[PDB]
Nucleic acid binder design. Structure first.
Lengths: 75, 243, 81, 242, 394
DNA sequence: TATATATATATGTGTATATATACACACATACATATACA
DNA sequence: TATATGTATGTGTGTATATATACACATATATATATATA
């Protein structure tokens, strides 16, 4: 059967947008952990959802985009 | 690639082996780099933006890595490369081939032990027969103060596989050949006696650092074995340690 | 410390280990504990399989059979000489 | 692939015999065939028997006459249905099948099978395993197991006969390789030289725990000790026997 | 079934044709309601983004397709394209031009053929190429497509021939692929082979075929992967093989080395390996439309798959040989060995070296034996004395 | 294009070291695969 | 958590099968390596 999808349902079903929509092994996955006033970058040896990290990432890069866009400006 | 090109250059410079070929994995496997900034005009391989897409020549044409950073990096990397050249390939090994040590080699009575260097293995069979006369020869030697090693047939001569380099300081130096360096017999006997090539052995507290303090060549009596290879052995010890 | 034709082997024990050998390597009445420790017996196990005249295998059970098979050949050889 | 004709072989002579005068030799492929032939004769005073040990002993006119007829003398193996049991008997990990088989001698080859092999030019694997492999295994039992009368094998019997013949005039010493050359010439030994010299060395040895308690020879030189099991002798250019 | 996939690349035009059931020649209701005109299924399949039969993929589905996007990406980068598809009763021809801007109405006739063909001209100039393609661009692109077809030929089933420019594609096995990739770095080399199976469905339905070469003249680890038909370059299947081989290599290296102290890692273990992995894996996901990298939990392989131990042992042996080597024959090839007349050739396996002297003397009687053999169809090799038997060692 | 290295091959008569493979069987060392449990 | 229990390797003997390698010695030739010229 040939189906036509909209953006919404597509993005919920398809991994092409943000990565896998379930937990997979992400090679090089790191996080920052505090050990007595010291930041350490440590590996996270546990599967996680790439799309879940992407929704954080998309907003964060929108913010840093705005920062560059305004850095030579008045406001 | 930039770091690798410099690392290869200085590795071949610093190494006097001058033959080994290392690639990017050797160059870079000890590196952790952080790169942060903006690049105009890049493209990606998908929405996730895992991989940026660009012509390599953008950097070859436009960017330059400061040489102080390249030099520092190459220095650290080649230090590790030489440490891995002194280790790995050259790690802890074992005794030499057809060699029977004495019970008192390199100890408190190290100087009073002999090395009966023989010509093959049938001679070592004779010497093993004879150094084990237990109570039938109370005045003879045994393995408490005697060892055995084979000369491998005919010794390589060193008097024509070596070159003199008169240094600009004045004192000339004597560099071996790669064929003479890699002979198994001579490497084995300078490993057994603990010899050194930049020690002239002129005083006695530097001759007390030999693993046992005499060599005795047990060779044949036909002219092929008494004249030839005994003469080449004498020539080797003349050319490197006449003292 | 062996000779050319005489055996003389010398072990050294770490202290307080003979009693552990005696209680750990047990003694039957066929072999000692020290011989069980130091591999000091073997079995004389035979496989008497020879070839016979005019070709072919022959398999004996004891050495008396080989002697009793051997004797008449020598007897007849004296008669013909 | 044994079904569909992939394994092939040549077929060379083992003995050629040359008649004086005539220009064609007689070629025998098995040794017992030649022995049964040569026992039938009454006067073999002008024939020259040539034994060809390996195939590199073949002269130039012989290799020319063997390579003019190359496709004439290649054969091909055909796989039977009874062949699995014979390949399991001869080369399997169970020895008692091989004891139970190898009592009786080799079955001689019939005339219909001979004409079929030489005419349609193909070989059944079972007919090969029950002649060639079985004849080899009987030969290896002959070479590697002693006779119960004298106690010695085939090689040591040749060595004793050649030693009685060699040292007859005076009991002067020889080397090991020179005496080995003698006993390979006069006793018609048809094998390699390294194994014969090793046999002479181990026939001369005498130490506490050696194989021989009453050796044939007196050994003169370094003949090894108890400690390395007699595996620490000299090379055969050094040591002597008598 | 699909019995063939014909691919061609000529004068810039690119074409691909398969022969299973065609795309349904039927009106698409919802697509027509959207378009307010008559739209048939091939037009949706080729011109409607996010549309296809894989919008709702099953967890066991091993097709590469998932997004309903790829075909329209082809159309959007085409100056002109022709979709032709027949279902055994009708044929359907539709032309899709100007980067999906001109979608001509289709032409539907009776036909008893059954197939699907996409034929198109890319926008080479818009994409950075010469118009028409230069000699080098043409040769590069032909070589790359030819490679992709060889990969298909190893991935596709056994009733399916892959053609490129009408010649069939040779490489129906991962061993063929391994030999193709290593013909220069390491000709005449040893190919370690394994079929990695799983015990639980759906994974047990899809064994992974693996071929690996191990050479001292390989400078880094290298893999070729066709997974679900996709030539992807990153995925935890590779890491599964890498880690397994490394664990065995470390064990046997510390065993074989009497140094007993040195510590090697995965780079040492694997930098002399070239591996081809081909097959299907159910339930995988990708990191984008390109499908460069598959996404999966590593434990899928730890739980379900096992690498045959014979392959692991062979591999570890070759690798540990190289390790110790880094720390510190007799085959006359015939002129026609492995070519068009390869089955006309013999291999005279002799027993030693004096036998080879005899045979080389014999095969060179050039005019004293005009009816004899020669080295045009005959080789030589040594049996090395006495052959090992395998009946006691298996 | 030049003057200059240092390593590299081949000939006869000599000096020395080796290594896989088959074949049988009693014996030694390495797990490992369960089966009660715990 | 100890126990057996059926797996798999592993040298070793005599008589066979087929090979491999280091060194000395003289002299003519060689193919790439090297200064400094510039």
């Amino acid at each position: 059967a040939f189906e036509i999808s909209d953006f919404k349902e597509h993005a919920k079903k398809k991994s092409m947008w943000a990565g896998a929509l379930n937990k997979v092994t992400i090679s090089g996955l790191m996080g920052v952990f505090t050990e007595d006033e010291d930041l350490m970058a440590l590996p996270i040896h546990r599967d996680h959802c790439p799309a879940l990290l992407k929704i954080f990432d998309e907003i964060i890069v929108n913010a840093t985009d705005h920062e560059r866009a305004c850095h030579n400006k008045t406001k | 690639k930039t770091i690798n090109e410099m690392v290869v250059k200085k590795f071949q410079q610093t190494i006097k082996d001058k033959n080994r070929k290392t690639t990017l994995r050797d160059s870079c496997s000890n590196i952790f780099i952080v790169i942060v900034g903006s690049i105009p005009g890049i493209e990606w391989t998908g929405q996730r933006k895992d991989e940026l897409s660009i012509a390599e020549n953008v950097f070859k044409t436009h960017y330059s890595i400061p040489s102080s950073f390249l030099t520092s990096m190459t220095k650290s990397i080649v230090d590790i490369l030489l440490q891995s050249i002194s280790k790995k390939d050259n790690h802890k090994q074992v005794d030499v081939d057809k060699y029977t040590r004495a019970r008192n080699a390199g100890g408190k009575r190290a100087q009073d032990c002999m090395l009966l260097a023989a010509e093959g293995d049938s001679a070592l069979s004779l010497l093993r027969t004879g150094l084990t006369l237990g109570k039938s020869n109370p005045s003879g030697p045994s393995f408490d103060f005697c060892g055995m090693i084979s000369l491998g047939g005919v010794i390589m001569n060193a008097c024509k596989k070596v070159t003199n380099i008169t240094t600009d300081s004045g004192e000339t130096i004597m560099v071996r050949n790669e064929q003479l360096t890699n002979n198994k017999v001579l490497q084995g006997i300078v490993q057994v006696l603990g010899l050194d090539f930049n020690c002239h052995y002129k005083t006695q507290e530097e001759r007390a650092k030999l693993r046992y303090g005499c060599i005795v060549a047990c060779v044949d009596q036909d002219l092929d074995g008494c004249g030839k290879i005994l003469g080449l052995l004498l020539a080797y010890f003349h050319l490197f340690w006449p003292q | 410390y062996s000779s050319s034709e005489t055996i003389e082997i010398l072990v050294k024990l770490k202290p307080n280990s003979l009693n552990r050998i005696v209680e750990e390597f047990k003694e039957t009445e066929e072999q000692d504990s020290i011989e069980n420790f130091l591999r000091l017996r073997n079995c004389l196990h035979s496989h008497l399989n020879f070839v016979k005249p005019k070709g072919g295998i022959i398999e004996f059970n004891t050495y008396y059979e080989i002697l009793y098979a051997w004797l008449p050949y020598r007897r007849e050889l004296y008669q013909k000489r | 692939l044994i079904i569909h004709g992939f394994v092939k072989r040549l077929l060379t002579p083992l003995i050629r015999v040359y008649e004086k005068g005539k220009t064609m030799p007689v070629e025998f492929y098995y040794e017992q065939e030649f022995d049964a032939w040569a026992k039938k004769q009454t006067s073999l005073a002008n024939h020259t028997v040539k034994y060809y040990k390996g195939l590199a002993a073949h002269d130039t006119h012989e290799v020319k006459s063997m390579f003019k007829h190359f496709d004439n003398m290649v054969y091909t193996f055909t796989l039977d249905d009874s062949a699995k049991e014979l390949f399991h008997i001869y080369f399997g990990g169970e020895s008692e099948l091989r004891k139970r088989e190898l009592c009786t001698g080799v079955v001689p080859l019939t005339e219909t099978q001979t004409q079929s092999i030489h005419s349609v030019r193909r070989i059944p694997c079972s007919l090969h395993l029950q002649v060639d492999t079985k004849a080899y295994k009987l030969d290896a039992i002959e070479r590697q197991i002693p006779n119960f009368l004298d106690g010695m094998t085939r090689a040591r019997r040749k060595i004793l006969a050649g030693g009685v013949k060699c040292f007859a005039s005076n009991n002067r010493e020889r080397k090991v390789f020179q005496f080995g050359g003698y006993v390979a010439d006069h006793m018609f030994y048809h094998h390699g030289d390294m194994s014969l010299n090793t046999s002479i060395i181990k026939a001369a040895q005498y130490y506490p725990g050696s194989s021989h308690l009453y050796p044939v020879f007196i050994g003169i030189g370094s003949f090894g000790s108890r400690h390395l099991g007699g595996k620490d002798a000299g090379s055969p250019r050094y040591i002597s026997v008598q | 079934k699909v019995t063939y996939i014909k691919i061609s690349f000529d004068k810039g035009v690119f074409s691909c044709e398969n022969d299973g059931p065609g795309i349904p020649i039927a009106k698409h209701e919802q697509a027509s309601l959207i378009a307010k005109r008559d739209v048939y299924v091939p037009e949706v399949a080729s011109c409607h983004f996010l549309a296809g039969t894989n919008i709702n993929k099953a967890k066991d589905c091993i097709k590469g397709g998932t997004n309903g996007v790829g075909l329209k990406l082809a159309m959007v980068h085409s100056q002109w394209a022709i979709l032709t598809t027949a279902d055994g009763a009708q044929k359907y021809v539709q032309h899709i031009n100007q980067r999906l801007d001109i979608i001509e109405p289709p032409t539907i006739t009776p036909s008893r053929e059954m197939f699907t063909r996409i034929e198109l001209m890319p926008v080479y100039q818009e994409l950075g190429y010469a118009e028409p393609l230069s000699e080098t661009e043409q040769a590069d692109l032909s070589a790359w497509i030819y490679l992709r077809a060889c990969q298909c030929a190893a991935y596709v089933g056994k009733g399916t021939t892959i053609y490129y420019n009408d010649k069939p594609c040779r490489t129906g096995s991962v061993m063929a692929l391994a030999k193709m990739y290593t013909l220069l770095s390491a000709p005449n080399s040893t190919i370690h082979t394994a079929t990695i199976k799983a015990d639980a469905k759906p994974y047990s339905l899809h064994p992974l075929q693996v071929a690996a070469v191990v050479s001292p003249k390989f400078k880094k680890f290298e893999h070729v992967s066709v997974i679900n038909g996709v030539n992807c370059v990153k995925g935890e299947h590779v890491t599964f093989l890498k880690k397994t081989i490394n664990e065995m290599v470390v064990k046997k290296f510390q065993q074989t080395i009497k140094d007993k102290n040195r510590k090697t890692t995965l780079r040492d273990s694997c930098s002399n390996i070239f591996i081809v992995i081909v097959g299907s894996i159910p339930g995988i996901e990708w990191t984008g439309q390109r499908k460069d990298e598959l996404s999966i939990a590593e434990n899928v392989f730890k739980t379900h798959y096992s690498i045959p131990s014979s392959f692991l042992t062979s591999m570890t042996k070759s690798i540990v040989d190289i390790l110790l080597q880094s720390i510190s024959d007799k085959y006359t090839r015939a002129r026609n060995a492995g070519g068009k007349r390869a089955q006309d050739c013999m291999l005279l396996a002799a027993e030693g070296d004096s036998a080879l002297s005899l045979l080389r003397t014999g095969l060179t009687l050039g005019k004293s034996n005009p009816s004899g053999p020669s080295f045009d169809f005959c080789g030589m090799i040594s049996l090395g004395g006495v052959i090992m038997n395998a009946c006691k060692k298996v």
